[PDB]
Design an enzyme around this catalytic site. Structure first.
Site, short mmCIF file in Angstrom:
data_model
loop_
_atom_site.label_atom_id
_atom_site.label_comp_id
_atom_site.label_asym_id
_atom_site.label_seq_id
_atom_site.Cartn_x
_atom_site.Cartn_y
_atom_site.Cartn_z
N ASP A 289 0.77 -1.07 0.07
CA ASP A 289 -0.05 -0.07 0.03
C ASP A 289 0.95 1.28 -0.25
OD1 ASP A 289 -3.00 -0.07 0.06
OD2 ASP A 289 -2.84 1.31 1.93
O1 LIG Z 1 4.61 2.78 -0.40
C1 LIG Z 1 4.90 2.07 0.43
C2 LIG Z 1 5.16 2.80 1.95
C3 LIG Z 1 4.88 1.80 2.98
N1 LIG Z 1 4.76 0.32 2.78
C4 LIG Z 1 4.68 -0.27 1.33
O2 LIG Z 1 4.52 -1.21 1.15
N2 LIG Z 1 4.84 0.54 0.43
#
Ligand SMILES: O=c1cc[nH]c(=O)[nH]1
Length: 225
Positions: A60
Protein backbone atom coordinates in the site's frame (compact mmCIF):
# COMPACT_ATOMS: atom_id res chain seq x y z
CA UNK A 1 10.41 -2.86 -25.54
CA UNK A 2 8.76 -0.36 -23.20
CA UNK A 3 6.15 -0.60 -20.49
CA UNK A 4 3.69 0.90 -22.90
CA UNK A 5 4.55 -1.69 -25.49
CA UNK A 6 3.69 -4.57 -23.12
CA UNK A 7 0.89 -2.93 -21.13
CA UNK A 8 -1.03 -0.98 -23.81
CA UNK A 9 -3.56 -3.78 -24.16
CA UNK A 10 -3.86 -4.27 -20.44
CA UNK A 11 -4.50 -0.57 -19.92
CA UNK A 12 -7.53 -0.81 -22.21
CA UNK A 13 -9.20 -3.49 -20.12
CA UNK A 14 -12.49 -2.57 -18.40
CA UNK A 15 -11.18 -3.59 -14.97
CA UNK A 16 -8.22 -1.25 -15.40
CA UNK A 17 -10.04 1.77 -16.85
CA UNK A 18 -12.67 1.17 -14.24
CA UNK A 19 -10.07 1.29 -11.51
CA UNK A 20 -9.03 4.73 -12.71
CA UNK A 21 -12.60 6.04 -12.98
CA UNK A 22 -13.30 4.98 -9.40
CA UNK A 23 -10.18 6.85 -8.27
CA UNK A 24 -11.11 9.93 -10.27
CA UNK A 25 -14.62 9.72 -8.78
CA UNK A 26 -13.26 9.42 -5.22
CA UNK A 27 -10.94 12.41 -5.74
CA UNK A 28 -14.00 14.62 -6.37
CA UNK A 29 -16.26 13.00 -3.79
CA UNK A 30 -14.85 14.78 -0.75
CA UNK A 31 -11.91 12.51 0.06
CA UNK A 32 -8.25 12.92 -0.63
CA UNK A 33 -6.52 10.16 -2.61
CA UNK A 34 -2.76 9.54 -2.44
CA UNK A 35 -0.60 9.84 -4.46
CA UNK A 36 -1.68 12.68 -6.80
CA UNK A 37 -2.89 11.31 -10.13
CA UNK A 38 0.27 12.46 -11.98
CA UNK A 39 2.37 10.39 -9.60
CA UNK A 40 0.44 7.13 -9.55
CA UNK A 41 2.61 5.50 -12.20
CA UNK A 42 5.88 7.10 -11.26
CA UNK A 43 7.62 3.77 -10.71
CA UNK A 44 7.04 3.12 -14.42
CA UNK A 45 8.19 6.63 -15.26
CA UNK A 46 11.55 6.39 -13.53
CA UNK A 47 12.31 2.74 -14.33
CA UNK A 48 11.57 1.61 -17.87
CA UNK A 49 10.94 -2.04 -18.57
CA UNK A 50 14.35 -2.71 -20.00
CA UNK A 51 16.07 -0.81 -17.21
CA UNK A 52 14.68 -2.98 -14.39
CA UNK A 53 17.53 -4.47 -12.34
CA UNK A 54 15.86 -4.82 -8.93
CA UNK A 55 12.23 -5.12 -8.07
CA UNK A 56 11.15 -4.11 -4.59
CA UNK A 57 7.45 -4.71 -4.00
CA UNK A 58 5.52 -2.73 -1.41
CA UNK A 59 1.79 -3.23 -0.80
CA UNK A 60 0.00 0.00 0.00
CA UNK A 61 1.13 3.59 -0.67
CA UNK A 62 1.73 5.82 2.33
CA UNK A 63 -1.57 7.49 3.20
CA UNK A 64 -0.52 10.84 4.72
CA UNK A 65 -0.08 14.25 3.13
CA UNK A 66 3.25 14.67 1.38
CA UNK A 67 4.29 11.04 1.71
CA UNK A 68 3.28 8.96 -1.32
CA UNK A 69 4.68 10.04 -4.67
CA UNK A 70 4.42 6.83 -6.72
CA UNK A 71 7.50 4.93 -5.52
CA UNK A 72 7.17 2.12 -2.94
CA UNK A 73 8.57 3.19 0.44
CA UNK A 74 9.74 6.64 -0.71
CA UNK A 75 8.54 10.04 0.54
CA UNK A 76 9.00 13.51 -0.94
CA UNK A 77 11.93 15.67 0.15
CA UNK A 78 11.37 17.46 3.44
CA UNK A 79 9.08 14.70 4.70
CA UNK A 80 10.05 12.64 7.73
CA UNK A 81 11.43 9.21 6.83
CA UNK A 82 8.61 6.72 7.66
CA UNK A 83 9.30 3.81 10.00
CA UNK A 84 9.42 1.22 7.19
CA UNK A 85 12.01 3.23 5.30
CA UNK A 86 13.94 3.89 8.51
CA UNK A 87 14.19 0.12 8.97
CA UNK A 88 15.38 -0.27 5.39
CA UNK A 89 18.04 2.37 6.11
CA UNK A 90 19.00 0.43 9.26
CA UNK A 91 19.67 -2.79 7.34
CA UNK A 92 21.51 -0.76 4.74
CA UNK A 93 23.62 0.94 7.45
CA UNK A 94 24.49 -2.46 8.88
CA UNK A 95 25.46 -4.06 5.59
CA UNK A 96 26.51 -1.66 2.84
CA UNK A 97 30.07 -0.37 3.22
CA UNK A 98 30.19 3.38 3.80
CA UNK A 99 26.41 3.70 4.08
CA UNK A 100 25.17 6.27 6.60
CA UNK A 101 21.69 7.42 7.57
CA UNK A 102 20.23 9.70 4.83
CA UNK A 103 18.69 13.00 5.91
CA UNK A 104 15.71 12.31 3.66
CA UNK A 105 13.42 9.47 2.47
CA UNK A 106 13.41 10.24 -1.25
CA UNK A 107 14.31 7.23 -3.37
CA UNK A 108 14.06 8.53 -6.96
CA UNK A 109 17.79 7.92 -7.35
CA UNK A 110 17.19 4.23 -6.64
CA UNK A 111 14.58 4.17 -9.40
CA UNK A 112 16.90 5.95 -11.85
CA UNK A 113 19.33 3.12 -11.27
CA UNK A 114 16.91 0.37 -12.17
CA UNK A 115 15.22 -0.27 -8.83
CA UNK A 116 11.50 -0.66 -9.64
CA UNK A 117 9.71 0.48 -6.47
CA UNK A 118 6.38 -1.08 -7.15
CA UNK A 119 3.45 -1.06 -4.78
CA UNK A 120 0.92 -3.81 -5.60
CA UNK A 121 -1.85 -1.25 -4.87
CA UNK A 122 -1.19 2.12 -6.44
CA UNK A 123 -3.67 4.44 -4.66
CA UNK A 124 -5.13 4.85 -1.18
CA UNK A 125 -7.64 7.10 0.57
CA UNK A 126 -5.99 9.55 2.98
CA UNK A 127 -5.43 8.01 6.43
CA UNK A 128 -7.10 4.76 5.38
CA UNK A 129 -4.65 1.92 4.68
CA UNK A 130 -5.63 -0.69 2.07
CA UNK A 131 -8.76 1.35 1.23
CA UNK A 132 -8.22 0.83 -2.52
CA UNK A 133 -6.96 -2.74 -2.17
CA UNK A 134 -10.00 -4.20 -3.89
CA UNK A 135 -10.21 -1.67 -6.74
CA UNK A 136 -8.43 -3.66 -9.46
CA UNK A 137 -4.83 -2.61 -8.82
CA UNK A 138 -3.69 -6.06 -7.69
CA UNK A 139 -4.81 -7.49 -11.06
CA UNK A 140 -2.81 -4.80 -12.87
CA UNK A 141 0.31 -5.35 -10.77
CA UNK A 142 -0.14 -9.10 -11.17
CA UNK A 143 0.17 -8.52 -14.88
CA UNK A 144 3.16 -6.20 -14.43
CA UNK A 145 5.14 -8.73 -12.46
CA UNK A 146 4.22 -11.45 -14.96
CA UNK A 147 5.48 -9.32 -17.84
CA UNK A 148 8.77 -8.70 -16.06
CA UNK A 149 9.15 -12.41 -15.42
CA UNK A 150 8.55 -13.09 -19.13
CA UNK A 151 10.29 -10.22 -20.87
CA UNK A 152 13.34 -9.61 -18.66
CA UNK A 153 16.28 -11.77 -17.64
CA UNK A 154 18.16 -11.89 -14.31
CA UNK A 155 16.16 -9.34 -12.38
CA UNK A 156 16.59 -9.42 -8.64
CA UNK A 157 13.27 -9.57 -6.83
CA UNK A 158 13.18 -8.47 -3.19
CA UNK A 159 9.96 -9.96 -1.77
CA UNK A 160 9.22 -8.55 1.67
CA UNK A 161 6.26 -10.01 3.57
CA UNK A 162 3.73 -12.76 2.79
CA UNK A 163 1.71 -10.63 0.36
CA UNK A 164 4.68 -9.79 -1.84
CA UNK A 165 5.89 -13.31 -1.53
CA UNK A 166 2.58 -14.68 -2.69
CA UNK A 167 2.51 -12.12 -5.44
CA UNK A 168 5.95 -13.22 -6.62
CA UNK A 169 5.36 -16.94 -6.41
CA UNK A 170 4.97 -17.19 -10.21
CA UNK A 171 8.46 -15.86 -10.77
CA UNK A 172 11.03 -18.02 -12.52
CA UNK A 173 13.68 -18.62 -9.88
CA UNK A 174 16.06 -19.98 -12.49
CA UNK A 175 15.88 -17.00 -14.82
CA UNK A 176 15.57 -14.47 -12.03
CA UNK A 177 16.88 -14.10 -8.51
CA UNK A 178 14.28 -14.09 -5.78
CA UNK A 179 15.14 -13.09 -2.21
CA UNK A 180 12.62 -13.38 0.63
CA UNK A 181 12.27 -11.60 3.97
CA UNK A 182 9.66 -10.17 6.36
CA UNK A 183 8.43 -6.60 5.73
CA UNK A 184 10.53 -3.70 7.07
CA UNK A 185 7.51 -2.32 8.84
CA UNK A 186 7.92 -2.00 12.62
CA UNK A 187 5.59 -4.93 13.28
CA UNK A 188 7.86 -7.38 11.48
CA UNK A 189 11.26 -5.78 10.81
CA UNK A 190 12.95 -7.43 13.78
CA UNK A 191 11.45 -10.80 12.82
CA UNK A 192 13.87 -11.41 9.96
CA UNK A 193 14.09 -8.23 7.89
CA UNK A 194 17.13 -7.14 9.90
CA UNK A 195 19.92 -9.44 8.82
CA UNK A 196 18.24 -10.40 5.52
CA UNK A 197 21.25 -8.76 3.79
CA UNK A 198 19.14 -8.23 0.68
CA UNK A 199 20.89 -5.06 -0.54
CA UNK A 200 24.32 -6.65 -0.62
CA UNK A 201 22.98 -9.91 -2.05
CA UNK A 202 21.22 -7.94 -4.74
CA UNK A 203 24.42 -6.22 -5.72
CA UNK A 204 26.49 -9.43 -5.66
CA UNK A 205 23.99 -11.04 -8.06
CA UNK A 206 24.09 -8.06 -10.40
CA UNK A 207 27.87 -8.08 -10.31
CA UNK A 208 28.00 -11.82 -11.04
CA UNK A 209 26.18 -11.13 -14.32
CA UNK A 210 28.13 -8.08 -15.43
CA UNK A 211 25.52 -5.60 -14.26
CA UNK A 212 26.62 -2.62 -12.23
CA UNK A 213 25.57 -2.64 -8.58
CA UNK A 214 23.05 -0.29 -7.03
CA UNK A 215 24.32 2.74 -5.10
CA UNK A 216 21.84 2.43 -2.24
CA UNK A 217 22.62 5.86 -0.72
CA UNK A 218 19.64 7.93 -1.88
CA UNK A 219 20.21 11.41 -3.25
CA UNK A 220 18.11 14.57 -3.22
CA UNK A 221 17.77 16.55 -6.45
CA UNK A 222 20.24 19.41 -6.33
CA UNK A 223 19.88 23.18 -6.22
CA UNK A 224 20.61 25.22 -9.32
CA UNK A 225 21.42 28.91 -9.58
O1 LIG B 1 4.75 2.81 -0.51
C1 LIG B 1 4.88 2.15 0.50
C2 LIG B 1 5.02 2.65 1.84
C3 LIG B 1 4.96 1.77 2.86
N1 LIG B 1 4.83 0.41 2.68
C4 LIG B 1 4.68 -0.15 1.42
O2 LIG B 1 4.55 -1.34 1.15
N2 LIG B 1 4.76 0.78 0.40
Amino acid sequence: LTWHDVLAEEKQQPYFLNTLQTVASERQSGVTIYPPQKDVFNAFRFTELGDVKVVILGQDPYHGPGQAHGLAFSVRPGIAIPPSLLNMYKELENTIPGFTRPNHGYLESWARQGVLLLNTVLTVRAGQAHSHASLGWETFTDKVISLINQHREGVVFLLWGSHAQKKGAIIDKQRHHVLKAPQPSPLSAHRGFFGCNHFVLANQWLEQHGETPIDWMPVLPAESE
